[PDB]
Amino acid sequence: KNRAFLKWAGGKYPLLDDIKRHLPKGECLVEPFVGAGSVFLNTDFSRYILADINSDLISLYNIVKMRTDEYVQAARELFVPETNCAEVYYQFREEFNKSQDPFRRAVLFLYLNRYGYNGLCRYNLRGEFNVPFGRYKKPYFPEAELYHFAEKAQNAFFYCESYADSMARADDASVVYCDPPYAPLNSFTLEQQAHLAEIAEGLVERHIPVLISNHDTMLTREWYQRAKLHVVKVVDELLALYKP
Amino acid sequence: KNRAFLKWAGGKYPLLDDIKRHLPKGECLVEPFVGAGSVFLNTDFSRYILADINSDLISLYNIVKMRTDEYVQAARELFVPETNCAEVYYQFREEFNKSQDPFRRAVLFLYLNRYGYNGLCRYNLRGEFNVPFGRYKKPYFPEAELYHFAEKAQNAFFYCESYADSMARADDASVVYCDPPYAPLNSFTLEQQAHLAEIAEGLVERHIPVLISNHDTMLTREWYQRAKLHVVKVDELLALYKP
Amino acid sequence: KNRAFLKWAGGKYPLLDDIKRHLPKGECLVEPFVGAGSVFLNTDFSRYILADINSDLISLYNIVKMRTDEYVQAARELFVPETNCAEVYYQFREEFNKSQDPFRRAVLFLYLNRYGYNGLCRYNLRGEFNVPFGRYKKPYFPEAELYHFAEKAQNAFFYCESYADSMARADDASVVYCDPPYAPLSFTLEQQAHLAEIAEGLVERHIPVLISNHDTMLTREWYQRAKLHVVKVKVDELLALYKP
Ligand SMILES: Nc1ncnc2c1ncn2[C@@H]1O[C@H](CSCC[C@H](N)C(=O)O)[C@@H](O)[C@H]1O
Numbered sequence: 001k002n003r004a005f006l007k008w009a010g011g012k013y014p015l016l017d018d019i020k021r022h023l024p025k026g027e028c029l030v031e032p033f034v035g036a037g038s039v040f041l042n043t044d045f046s047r048y049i050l051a052d053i054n055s056d057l058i059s060l061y062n063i064v065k066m067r068t069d070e071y072v073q074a075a076r077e078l079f080v081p082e083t084n085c086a087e088v089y090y091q092f093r094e095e096f097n098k099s100q101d102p103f104r105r106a107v108l109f110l111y112l113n114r115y116g117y118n119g120l121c122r123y124n125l126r127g128e129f130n131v132p133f134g135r136y137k138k139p140y141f142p143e144a145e146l147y148h149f150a151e152k153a154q155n156a157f158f159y160c161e162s163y164a165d166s167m168a169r170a171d172d173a174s175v176v177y178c179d180p181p182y183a184p185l186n187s188f189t190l191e192q193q194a195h196l197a198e199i200a201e202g203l204v205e206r207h208i209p210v211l212i213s214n215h216d217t218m219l220t221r222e223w224y225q226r227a228k229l230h231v232v233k234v235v236d237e238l239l240a241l242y243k244p
Numbered sequence: 245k246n247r248a249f250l251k252w253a254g255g256k257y258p259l260l261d262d263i264k265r266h267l268p269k270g271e272c273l274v275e276p277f278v279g280a281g282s283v284f285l286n287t288d289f290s291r292y293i294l295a296d297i298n299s300d301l302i303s304l305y306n307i308v309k310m311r312t313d314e315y316v317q318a319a320r321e322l323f324v325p326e327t328n329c330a331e332v333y334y335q336f337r338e339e340f341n342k343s344q345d346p347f348r349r350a351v352l353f354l355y356l357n358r359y360g361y362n363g364l365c366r367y368n369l370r371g372e373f374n375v376p377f378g379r380y381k382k383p384y385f386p387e388a389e390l391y392h393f394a395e396k397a398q399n400a401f402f403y404c405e406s407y408a409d410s411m412a413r414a415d416d417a418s419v420v421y422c423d424p425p426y427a428p429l430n431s432f433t434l435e436q437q438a439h440l441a442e443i444a445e446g447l448v449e450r451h452i453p454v455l456i457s458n459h460d461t462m463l464t465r466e467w468y469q470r471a472k473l474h475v476v477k478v479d480e481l482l483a484l485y486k487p
Numbered sequence: 488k489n490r491a492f493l494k495w496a497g498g499k500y501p502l503l504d505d506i507k508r509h510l511p512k513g514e515c516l517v518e519p520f521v522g523a524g525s526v527f528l529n530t531d532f533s534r535y536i537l538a539d540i541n542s543d544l545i546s547l548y549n550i551v552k553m554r555t556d557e558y559v560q561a562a563r564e565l566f567v568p569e570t571n572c573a574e575v576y577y578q579f580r581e582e583f584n585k586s587q588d589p590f591r592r593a594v595l596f597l598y599l600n601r602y603g604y605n606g607l608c609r610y611n612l613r614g615e616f617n618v619p620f621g622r623y624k625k626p627y628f629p630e631a632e633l634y635h636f637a638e639k640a641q642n643a644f645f646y647c648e649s650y651a652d653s654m655a656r657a658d659d660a661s662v663v664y665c666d667p668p669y670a671p672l673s674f675t676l677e678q679q680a681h682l683a684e685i686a687e688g689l690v691e692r693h694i695p696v697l698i699s700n701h702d703t704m705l706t707r708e709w710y711q712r713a714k715l716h717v718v719k720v721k722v723d724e725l726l727a728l729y730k731p
Pocket residue numbers: 008009010011012013032033034035036037038039051052053054161162163179180181188
C-alpha cells in the first residue's frame with residue numbers, strides 16, 4: 001500500500017480495503033475532496049479528476065506534477081537538523097504567509113505539514129496559516145512518496161473548486177468518491193452535507209456511480225437514506241453507495 | 245419486573261429498585277413525565293394520573309386503554325417481514341406525518357418506535373417525525389407488554405399537558421413522581437428545572453409527598469436543596485420531599 | 488511539603504516538583520494568580536507580592552495575616568458536628584451573602600470552602616456566592632495550615648487586582664509565576680494572549696517569568712517565544728519558561 005506525502009486529518013489510509021471493496025470500476029475517478037490523496041494513490045483508474053477547496057493544496061499538487069525534480073531538490077533542503085526548532089519554524093511560517101511566489105510557498109507548505117502541531121492545516125480569520133510548532137522526534141522527508149505522487153499525477157487534473165463544480169465534471173465513464181469533512185457527533189455546514197447527498201442522487205439517476213464516506217449517525221443515515229449502506233468497524237464509519 | 249411496550253430514551257428500568265425503596269405510598273400516583281411508563285407498570289397504586297407534553301404518546305396510550313384488541317390486531321400487521329426495509333420505513337414515516345387519523349397514527353407510531361434508529365422520538369422544525377431507519381435484523385412485536393399495559397391502564401387517566409398542570413391535580417391522597425429530562429453535564433430549560441423544584445416545595449407543604457429523579461450535579465443539589473437527597477450508582481440522585 | 492488551608496480548584500500541590508525544577512531564583516516572587524497559595528507556601532523567597540481578582544480571597548488573607556489568633560479562634564467554632572448539615576450550610580451562606588463585616592465574612596468563607604460542593608468558589612449574576620452543600624464525611628479544620636500561612640505572610644503583600652496591574656509591580660530582583668485559569672479543551676482567550684504578551688515584555692527587561700497551563704494548540708501558539716516543558720499525569724500540562 002502506498003502512503004501519501006502529506007500528513008492530513010481524515011487521511012483515509014487506515015481503511016482503503018473497505019473502500020476498494022465497494023468502489024465500482026470505470027475509466028475515470030472524480031474526487032471532490034481529494035485532501036491527501038490516498039484513494040487516488042491506491043487505485044488504478046485510467047484517469048483522475050481531483051479537487052479541493054484549499055487553494056494552497058491544489059497549488060502544491062500542480063507544482064509537484066509539473067516541476068517534480070526542481071521541487072523535490074528544493075524541499076529536501078529544509079528537512080535538515082538545523083530546522084527542527086521553534087525559532088526556525090515561526091520564521092518559516094511568517095515567510096509563507098508573506099510570500100506571493102507559488103513555488104516557494106509550496107516548499108514551505110510541506111515543511112509546515114511535517115513540523116507543525118499534528119500535521120494540521122489551519123488559517124486565522126485573516127487567511128494566515130496559524131498552526132504552531134509540533135515538537136517532533138525527527139520528521140521524515142517523504143521522498144519516495146513525492147516521486148510516486150508525481151508519476152501518478154501524469155494522469156490527473158487538479159482543480160481548486162467546491163464539491164458542486166467538481167462533481168459536475170463527472171460523466172458516463174466516471175466514478176465519484178466523496179470524503180467530505182466529517183459530520184458532527186466556519187467550515188462545512190449541515191446544509192452542504194445534505195446538498196452533497198442530493199447531488200449524488202442526481203448522479204446515480206444518470207448512471208454515474210457515487211460512493212460517500214462519513215461517520216455513522218442519525219444525521220448521516222437521514223442524508224444518505226437512498227444509498228446502500230455499509231457500516232465499518234474501528235466510532236463507526238459508514239459507506240454509502242449509489243449503484244445504478 | 246414488567247417491561248414497557250415502547251423503547252424510550254430515559255426509561256427507568258435499571259433504577260426501579262431504588263425508586264421503589266424511597267417512593268412513599270398512597271391511593272394515587274401522579275407522573276408528570278410518564279414517558280414509557282416503567283414506574284406505572286411496576287407499582288401497585290389504586291389509581292394513576294399520567295401525563296406528558298408529547299401528544300403522540302398520550303393519544304397512543306388512550307387508544308391502548310380504550311380499544312385494546314382492535315389496536316393489537318392492526319399494529320401486528322406492520323411487523324410482518326415485508327415491512328423490514330428502508331423503502332417501507334420511509335413510506336410509513338411519510339404516511340404518519342401526513343395522516344390526520346389518530347388511530348392509524350397510533351399504529352404507525354409503534355412501527356417507527358421499533359424500526360427507527362435507536363428507538364428515538366424526534367421532530368424537525370416543521371413538526372414532522374424525523375428519525376431515520378434503524379436497520380435492525382428482527383424487531384420484537386411487544387404483544388405481551390401491550391396487553392399488560394392495557395390491563396393496568398384501566399385504573400389510569402392520561403393527559404397531554406405540561407408539568408405544572410398535571411402537578412396541580414395531586415391531592416392529599418396522592419404521591420408525585422417526577423422524571424424530568426435530565427439536567428446537563430425547544431427542549432426543557434433551566435428555568436423549568438428550577439420551577440419544578442419550586443412546585444414540589446409547595447406540594448410538600450400541602451402534605452403531598454414528591455420524589456424527583458435527576459443526574460447528580462452542582463445545579464441539581466442547588467435546585468433540590470430542601471429535600472432529603474440520596475445518591476445512586478455518572479451518578480443518579482433522588483430528591484425526596486417527605487412531609 | 489506544606490498544604491494550603493483552602494481547597495482550591497486547580498491547586499498546584501501535585502505539580503510542585505515540576506514547578507520548583509523550572510522556577511528561577513531571585514529576591515521577590517510575584518504571583519498574579521495566587522489562588523490558594525501552594526507555590527508561595529513551598530518556596531523560600533525573601534519577599535512576596537501576591538494578587539488575585541477575587542476580593543473575598545485577598546480580604547481573607549489580610550485577616551489571616553493581621554488578625555491570626557482572633558481568626559483561628561472564631562473559625563474553629565464553625566467546624567463542629569451541629570454545622571455539618573444542609574439547613575445550617577444554607578443558613579450560613581445566606582449570612583455570608585448578606586453581611587457587610589469583613590471579619591465575619593472571612594470566617595464564613597472558610598466554612599463554605601470546606602463544607603461546599605467540591606470546594607468550589609462560584610458566584611451568580613447577582614454576585615452572591617452560590618455553591619451548594621457538599622455532604623462531606625467530617626471536614627478537616629485547617630489549623631496548622633492557617634498558622635503556617637500567617638507566619639509566612641509576614642513577608643508578603645496581598646493585592647486585589649487584575650494580572651496586568653500586579654505584573655507591573657515586578658522589578659529586576661523579581662521572578663513571576665503565572666497560574667491563569669485554564670485554556671479550553673470568566674477568563675477570555677484575548678486575556679490568555681495578553682498574558683503571554685506581558686511575559687514577553689518582562690523577559691526583555693531581564694525579569695524571568697514561568698507560566699502554567701494545559702498542553703494544547705492555543706497554549707503552544709501563545710507561549711511560542713518560551714522554552715516549553717511538558718509534564719505528565721488526564722490531559723497533560725505545560726510549563727512555559729521565559730529566561731533572560
Ligand atoms: N466545500 C468544499 N468543497 C471541496 N472541498 C472541501 C470543501 N470543504 C472542505 N473541503 C476539503 O475536503 C477535505 C476533507 S478531508 C479528505 C481526505 C482525503 N479523503 C484523503 O485521503 O486525504 C479537505 O481537504 C478540505 O479542504
